[PDB]
Design a protein around this ligand. Sequence first.
Ligand SMILES: Cc1cc2nc3c(=O)[nH]c(=O)nc-3n(C[C@H](O)[C@H](O)[C@H](O)COP(=O)(O)O)c2cc1C
Ligand SMILES: Cc1cc2nc3c(=O)[nH]c(=O)nc-3n(C[C@H](O)[C@H](O)[C@H](O)COP(=O)(O)O)c2cc1C
Ligand SMILES: Cc1cc2nc3c(=O)[nH]c(=O)nc-3n(C[C@H](O)[C@H](O)[C@H](O)COP(=O)(O)O)c2cc1C
Ligand SMILES: Cc1cc2nc3c(=O)[nH]c(=O)nc-3n(C[C@H](O)[C@H](O)[C@H](O)COP(=O)(O)O)c2cc1C
Ligand SMILES: c1ccc2c(c1)sc1ccccc12
Ligand SMILES: c1ccc2c(c1)sc1ccccc12
Ligand SMILES: c1ccc2c(c1)sc1ccccc12
Lengths: 400, 400, 400, 400
Amino acid sequence: HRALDVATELAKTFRVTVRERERAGGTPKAERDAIRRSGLLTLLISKERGGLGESWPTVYEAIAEIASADASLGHLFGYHFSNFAYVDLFASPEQKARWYPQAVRERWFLGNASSENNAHVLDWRVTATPLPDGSYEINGTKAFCSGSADADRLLVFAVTSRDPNGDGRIVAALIPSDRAGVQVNGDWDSLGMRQTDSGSVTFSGVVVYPDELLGTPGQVTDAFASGSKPSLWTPITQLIFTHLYLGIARGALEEAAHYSRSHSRPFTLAGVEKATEDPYVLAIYGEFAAQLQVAEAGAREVALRVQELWERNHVTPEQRGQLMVQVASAKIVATRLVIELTSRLYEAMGARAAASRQFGFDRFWRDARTHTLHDPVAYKIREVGNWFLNHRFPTPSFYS
Amino acid sequence: HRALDVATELAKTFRVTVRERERAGGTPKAERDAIRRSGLLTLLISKERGGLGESWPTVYEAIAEIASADASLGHLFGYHFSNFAYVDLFASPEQKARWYPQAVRERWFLGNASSENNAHVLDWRVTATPLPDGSYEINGTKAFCSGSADADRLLVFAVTSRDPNGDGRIVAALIPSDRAGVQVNGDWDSLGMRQTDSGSVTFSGVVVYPDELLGTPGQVTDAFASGSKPSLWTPITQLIFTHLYLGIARGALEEAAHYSRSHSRPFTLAGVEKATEDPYVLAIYGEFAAQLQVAEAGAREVALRVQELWERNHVTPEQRGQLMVQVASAKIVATRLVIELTSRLYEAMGARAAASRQFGFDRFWRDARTHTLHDPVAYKIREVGNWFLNHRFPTPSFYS
Amino acid sequence: HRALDVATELAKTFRVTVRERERAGGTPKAERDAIRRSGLLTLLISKERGGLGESWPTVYEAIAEIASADASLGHLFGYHFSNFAYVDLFASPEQKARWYPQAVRERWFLGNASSENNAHVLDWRVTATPLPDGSYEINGTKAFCSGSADADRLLVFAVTSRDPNGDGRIVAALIPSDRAGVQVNGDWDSLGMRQTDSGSVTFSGVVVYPDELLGTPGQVTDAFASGSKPSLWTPITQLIFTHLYLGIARGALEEAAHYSRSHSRPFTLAGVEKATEDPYVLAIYGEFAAQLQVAEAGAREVALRVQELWERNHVTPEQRGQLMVQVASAKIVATRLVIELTSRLYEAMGARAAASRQFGFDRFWRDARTHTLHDPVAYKIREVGNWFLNHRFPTPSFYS
Amino acid sequence: HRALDVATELAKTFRVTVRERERAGGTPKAERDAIRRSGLLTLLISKERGGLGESWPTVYEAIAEIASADASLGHLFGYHFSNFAYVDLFASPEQKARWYPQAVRERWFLGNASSENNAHVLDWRVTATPLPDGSYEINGTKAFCSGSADADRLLVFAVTSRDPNGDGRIVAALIPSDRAGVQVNGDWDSLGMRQTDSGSVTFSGVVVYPDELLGTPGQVTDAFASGSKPSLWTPITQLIFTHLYLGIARGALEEAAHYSRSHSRPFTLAGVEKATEDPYVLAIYGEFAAQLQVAEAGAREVALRVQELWERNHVTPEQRGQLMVQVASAKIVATRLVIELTSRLYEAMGARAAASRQFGFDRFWRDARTHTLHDPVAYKIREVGNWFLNHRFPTPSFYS
Ligand SMILES: Cc1cc2nc3c(=O)[nH]c(=O)nc-3n(C[C@H](O)[C@H](O)[C@H](O)COP(=O)(O)O)c2cc1C
Ligand SMILES: Cc1cc2nc3c(=O)[nH]c(=O)nc-3n(C[C@H](O)[C@H](O)[C@H](O)COP(=O)(O)O)c2cc1C
Ligand SMILES: Cc1cc2nc3c(=O)[nH]c(=O)nc-3n(C[C@H](O)[C@H](O)[C@H](O)COP(=O)(O)O)c2cc1C
Ligand SMILES: Cc1cc2nc3c(=O)[nH]c(=O)nc-3n(C[C@H](O)[C@H](O)[C@H](O)COP(=O)(O)O)c2cc1C
Ligand SMILES: c1ccc2c(c1)sc1ccccc12
Ligand SMILES: c1ccc2c(c1)sc1ccccc12
Ligand SMILES: c1ccc2c(c1)sc1ccccc12
């Protein structure tokens, strides 16, 4: 229970200052260094390599706990583990032996530069052109690069260009954020998630060496199309997002409840003597706490299944498909829950909870409302419907 | 897995005939006898006493499976385990050493006569008059006596009367359904749950012998008041109801999807070519399938905790209260899900699914609409809200 | 107020017997004759021609009031006016001069035979083949022929075949229901709307004469595509459906309230002394009555606009499209309301309202759930959204 | 039509600057002066007295129009008419003969100081101490004094103290905001409604002269208890709030639609090519636009009834109660609509609508979420339920 106690203490510390920090935006450097000092960035690194030797259920619980205190830090922490998962699923034994002890000693906090701001999510224009001796050169701009500021290593994706062994192949690499030609742009000014540093990143002639490549170019496409073990990356990552939404939900419900207990006035016009005994206040808390209990219990079960399949040598298409359906279902339910709860709970607190902007309760809705648009919930709903009605598992990809 | 395989095969046979049987109402004797021959009524009896020595997770899964095929049979089966749970929590070791091998040998299917139709659910008027030899005489009429027809034993509740040691004290007993003076009235004629035989039972001078009594007078009240282990009866039973709702929900979704694949016509007016590719059909299946996956996953966690506390020698009010809150939340979510989907799934099927009465899909809504009224979900919502906001566990009762 | 008083009195009488009549299904001949005697079938015929010279707001109010007592009689009554509206929009001056006094004298109650059960709703295969002197012969089977039993005249639609003047043109005619070769099949057996007689009708060599044709073959296609005055038929008819749903909603709300005042028990476990003072019972009635008040007030405005445009010589595409959008909006809101309310009101009444099948409250949900599937509400929603987002009015058709 | 054209033009100009102005908060002096110059503040003053002699339907439509551009200015404009309505309902004919020509000539924009921040609403501590001449000395601080800054007159409420003719009676008056001892505090820093100046006002020995008093002490209480014409103030004012919510809803829908047409990217992962043709985007717009059409149509009818009763010399409790129920119903529907729509419309726009804080669409949710808490919608729901189920009209008060 030690790692979770560490995460709980981190979250308590983050609650004290999140109101003022999130207003200013920018990089939460002091808090990222506290996470570095905590050791939790090493949860999934084996003890033999210097890490904590912990499991995915612990990682998910820590993500939700931190997210309940500070959604931007929960996002950054969770995305670190999405990046780590990708690295771990493709790294060679040589790379793990070098990188993981280094990640412990240098306290790596991983960032990524993957998505782009073109015509659609599939229009990728960051290229990797081959160099002598097996290196590549990266050129172009990436968007929504969560945790790219103050990241020690960047997980980067590019498409092979002018490549004699095949253009259009997806290359992934793990490079130092201070490699020449890498420019983090710090242009993140959002409604919520205001400290995630999810702005754009530009690559000018950036060299990637062979010992930084995560598999051969195109290997990710083969692993996903085949259902190899790396196809677990998408359910793992979407369950990370699910735990952000559940953490935000619980944080909002608990903060509202503290307000109601200490500050809400009874509607004596209707004969109520105490706001905490009002039947409609109690009904609001009961409706949302009930949905949260069921969603949290369901999320714990799916997290245990993530761990189970993580440990297998091979995951069948049925096992991976079933997991992806369970994860998508959890994310759908958590998305609806957090969006509704963070808005409707004002009705349990009363007008003064909005009349003083500084109370800051709208941070929960602003964070949830921003992040949940990460990928459209309508098409997660369509994928679950296509599975149930047509017996079609989602196609493994970066989004399903 | 053997036990769940047997339940799955039972459910398959019940699906073949449920549409015809439930119209008639009345007692599903052949199907009750099939359940008797299956051995599953002995799921929770230890192997040492001739039973299967299985766990509550298996019982709850079996309940949902059967209920997905025939909600009345799922109800009869589930209430048998509610009755069994009461006996197990209150009978002496000496009584259980006699009753349980007899229940196995005689293939006992339990019913109950407990609630009444007076001014409100607390108002009980069926009396137990003490006789000099330690026996009691029972007089009065009970309502909603599920499984009272064809029952090998009835779990019966009465309040003491003409009692020098105190009137109004609740006594419970397990008695043969054909004991002199017991009249099963056969007046069950309901919207849904049409074969549960939940009619009235009239007791005329019915003798109860000392070795048929479950505890002492008022003992159930004392156990409720102290939140001790016998008060687990309520979360156990409320979780039985939850699994009826999850089972009905799954059955309705599967039956609707079969119609959507086989008979629904594409809305060509809007350019649709296949109903199974219609975006709004797919969204209905996705939304409800997603909520069902999360609810079923959370329900499995709560069932594991039921088993945990069932095996304990002592249970504290905090353990019992936390379990009751988790059960209540599961019941709330399942109630809303089943009531919504059994009505809205018609929109995924089309007009002819209702215009052809013989299709009989309305059975799912009728069954769920009837059963979910067992006790008011508004007060399960209040109970979860009072816990979350005011840190007050539900007051243990026959309902909470 | 005379006409509305007559409809109110009719509805009063229908309420006495609807519970018994709709169980049996079949043709409500006695009630149809009571409507004939009332004169209300002539509401839209000018006094000059022997009718009442009333307005569409009166028709719509009468439809909703009758539907609140008996949805099948409300449906038959309303569809009579959809049939009359089609006739009035396409009939020649000499057809009106002959038919309308005859409809008054003979107390005509109209039915129709229009839709079919082929691959999709566009797919019409009942043929009209030329005969000498401009007559046509009709062959094939129609489905969903509301009011086709006991009909004085049938509005029938067919597609021309082996026609020198052009194949595949839609022809419409108003013919006697007992003409040789017309076989009303009497096969309506529905979940709800059980006395609308909406079964199939088979046409074997049925002769239609030129003086029974409603415009030339294909004229309806041209009138809808061009937005000439007959394009009002669809918003008129969809608003008829809307008033069926509002009528059912009001009838259900009022019937539930009577049960709650008379029979519901207080939940004394939570300290409630009277069910009519329960905060959650009150919230259910308040939610649904509030939405009903708004929906009804909105529907009055749209019905007035129907009358205003009905009196216009020419209606622009803006005026027709805005009306169709207002009608579709009213129908969407009414559909959601009646489907939710007819199911959720059980929670304000209690278990015994469902456990005693004879109470028959489920008739409201059965009727509403059946009729609201007439055409898919998802595509009414799309039509309103296409208008608001893209400024595209719905393409006029039999559906929009 | 001229007045509404003027309001539409005002709203056009407000939309240009609202994003920048509402961020700063404070007093929108230039825009208040634009409203002064428009003459619309005199809409309800008779032409005889120099006003526009217009109707409440015109006022309500102008309130919604302005609120759709700038919710704070719509609120200020709307509350001006609430203040005016109170004056008209309680002022003597002689008072109006002086005040209304002055309000025209001096372009009065009214504010109020009425509510307070004590243990519960209606727990009032601002006192009125009688002076020998019939004046009152006012002492205390008022809360939520909308429009208190830059107000030409304040409508003020106090409770009598040290009063031989009875303590605790409510007095009301209309006084200059620069009367000696009046301090408008400017302490308003809110989530939304950021330019309504709803801070506190402190009265230090403020003398109120006899010709400024509105009625006699406790007359407002007696009017409420009688349900007589002056108690129309509450339904009038609650319908003002309703039109704020309908205006915010319409403004949010149109602003979102503009973004969707201009900036939303199609989700090619699913094969869609234009965001404005996405089936789920279209469903969101259609669902909310449909609900909005019906709500707006219904609100127009209730506004016509406000005008009817406003022109009567006497109003019965039944007429007032029926109107209050209709107003409560409109408020309930509008509240639910605006709160859902201002949050869910992000799903129709996509992530970049929230990633760019400066888009500023969250203003609609912040404004609606703040104002809808004015009084709890849960008790409007109970009030409508108590009327429908128990035939009890709402108890007249400042809130019902
Ligand atoms: C708060 C937030 C954080 C995001 N973080 C990442 C990220 O770390 N890596 C990535 O590839 N995309 C990230 N995305 C991008 C989304 O996956 C997606 O590309 C984007 O939301 C599409 O925007 P649209 O809906 O306007 O088309 C993020 C998006 C949001 C809103
Ligand atoms: C934006 C806003 C403006 C308000 N303006 C006024 C006002 O002008 N006059 C008034 O008496 N109350 C005003 N109120 C207050 C309500 O009457 C009520 O006192 C308050 O909303 C209750 O606060 P609570 O729910 O936190 O207990 C306003 C409230 C809000 C939220
Ligand atoms: C109760 C009911 C009555 C109907 N009455 C008629 C009718 O009178 N004339 C007609 O053309 N269609 C009628 N329809 C049919 C619709 O036009 C449409 O063909 C049908 O609902 C589509 O069926 P589907 O959703 O199963 O494909 C009726 C449908 C229902 C449910
Ligand atoms: C389908 C159904 C089955 C029921 N079976 C039982 C039962 O077996 N034993 C029992 O004590 N109560 C049973 N109940 C009754 C509830 O405990 C409760 O008394 C009843 O639902 C309250 O009815 P009311 O809401 O109309 O007041 C049953 C209720 C329903 C609806
Ligand atoms: C109140 C009292 C006893 C019981 C209920 C409600 S449901 C049920 C099911 C089985 C056995 C007893 C009881
Ligand atoms: C397609 C074509 C004709 C008709 C429908 C659908 S519903 C209806 C109701 C009355 C008369 C004609 C029609
Ligand atoms: C309680 C008492 C007075 C008032 C409210 C609530 S809102 C409002 C708006 C304008 C004028 C007076 C009041």
